[PDB]
Amino acid sequence: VIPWQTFDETIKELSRFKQEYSQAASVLVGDIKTLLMDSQDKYFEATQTVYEWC
């Protein structure tokens, strides 16, 4: 008379969607952060080399 198992299955499905996409997005944003810091290190090295030559 009270459908509790379908309620639990719906809650677990709508939670599993969000868990999956948080786990998928966090690693990719953390990789973009590393790339953006390595680019700044290469930029600093190149501009400092040209400045020291000039």
Binding site: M37, D38, D41, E45
Partner: protein, 54 residues
């Protein structure tokens, strides 16, 4: 610590042109500056890799 005394020796000895020590002073200057350029370049490369490690 070595460079700031060898250059002061250069200024002290050659207020007038001492032709006897002129052939060795050039070798001393070339040796100490070629040592210094290599040490400063290796120090900058080491600090760059240490900055890129994070």
């Amino acid at each position: 610590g070595v460079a700031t005394q060898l250059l002061a020796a250069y200024i002290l000895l050659f207020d007038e042109y001492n032709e006897k020590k002129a052939s060795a002073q050039k070798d001393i200057l070339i040796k100490v500056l070629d040592d210094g350029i290599t040490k400063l370049n290796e120090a900058q490369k080491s600090l760059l890799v240490s900055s890129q490690s994070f």
